[PDB]
């Protein structure tokens, strides 16, 4: 019954001509619900889940103001950081920002986040206590001193513990039918001979939500990692996720092997065995 809200911003400079490309996305758990793309025609924050479309024009006006202003802030910051790092004006660079909050099943604040990167490495991040910053290098130390003087952590903390938690709660009751549902994995095993003496067993998990899942093989009841392969969890494109795990076994010995599936939507883990 725990939940999260996150925003992800990406700004990429383009020195051949014009302003940086800015993309913002918002998520509740593993469900995207809004986007902004500075190269799109609308120039508005846009809905990406049916349940947010009910929000009124004032909602969209305020969210659009914020992300358009953020795109300008990032533009300025790309310039400032180029200077801090003594980089040329000719190259493209990237700023990334993530922030958001986690709540417990009671809907109360658990944890807040705010972290920033430059060219795919840590730049500055708010600590878990929401009261202090971690600056990765002497460039980020400059930013840290400025942010301390501006009481930026206090401002971030008030949002993370206040508005973030309150709007996450509102969305969870607005999109309840999907956001508060768990879809357990649809599981099955396949069998593929490799040679006269070996075969692959593959354990499939399909259609599950949220994305967190664990697949594990055992042989005669003991965990087995030798001769196994696993794919990264992947989106199906319809709001659900997929994963598989495989093991190579001597042919005839298939019944020794079991696949064990853990997911939030399963009251007890599932066990599968080739018959």
């Amino acid at each position: 019954g725990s939940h999260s809200m996150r925003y992800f911003y990406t700004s990429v400079s383009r020195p051949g001509r014009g302003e940086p490309r800015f993309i913002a996305v918002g998520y509740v758990d593993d469900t995207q619900f809004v986007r902004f793309d500075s190269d799109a025609a609308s120039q508005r924050m846009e809905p990406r889940a049916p349940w947010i479309e009910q929000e009124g024009p004032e909602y969209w006006d305020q969210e659009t103001r914020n992300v358009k202003a953020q795109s300008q802030t990032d533009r300025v910051d790309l310039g400032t950081l180029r200077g801090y790092y003594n980089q040329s004006e000719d190259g493209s660079h990237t700023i990334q920002i993530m922030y958001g909050c986690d709540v417990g099943p009671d809907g109360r604040f658990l944890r807040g986040y705010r972290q920033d990167a430059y060219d795919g490495k840590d730049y500055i991040a708010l600590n878990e206590d929401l009261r202090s910053w971690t600056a990765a290098d002497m460039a980020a130390q400059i930013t840290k001193r400025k942010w301390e003087a501006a009481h930026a952590a206090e401002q971030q903390r008030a949002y993370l513990e206040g508005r973030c938690v309150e709007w996450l709660r509102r969305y969870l009751e607005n999109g309840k039918e999907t956001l508060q549902r768990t879809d357990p994995p649809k599981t099955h095993m396949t069998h593929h001979p490799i040679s006269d003496h070996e075969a692959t067993l593959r354990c499939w998990a399909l259609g599950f939500y949220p994305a967190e899942i664990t697949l594990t093989w055992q042989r005669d009841g003991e965990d087995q990692t030798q001769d196994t392969e696993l794919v990264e969890t992947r989106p199906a494109g319809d709001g659900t996720f997929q994963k598989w795990a495989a093991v190579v076994v001597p042919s005839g010995e298939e019944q020794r092997y079991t696949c064990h599936v853990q997911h939030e939507g399963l009251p007890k883990p599932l066990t599968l065995r080739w018959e």
């Binding site: 925003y7 913002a24 918002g26 909602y59 305020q62 969210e63 914020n66 992300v67 202003a69 953020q70 300008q72 802030t73 300025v76 910051d77 400032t80 950081l81 922030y99 500055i124 930013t143 400025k146 942010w147 501006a150 930026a152 401002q155 971030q156 949002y159 508005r163 973030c164 709007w167």
Partner: peptide, 9 residues
């Protein structure tokens, strides 16, 4: 809902 832009870097 988003947080407004924070202080420049």
């Amino acid at each position: 809902k988003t947080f407004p832009p924070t202080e420049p870097k």
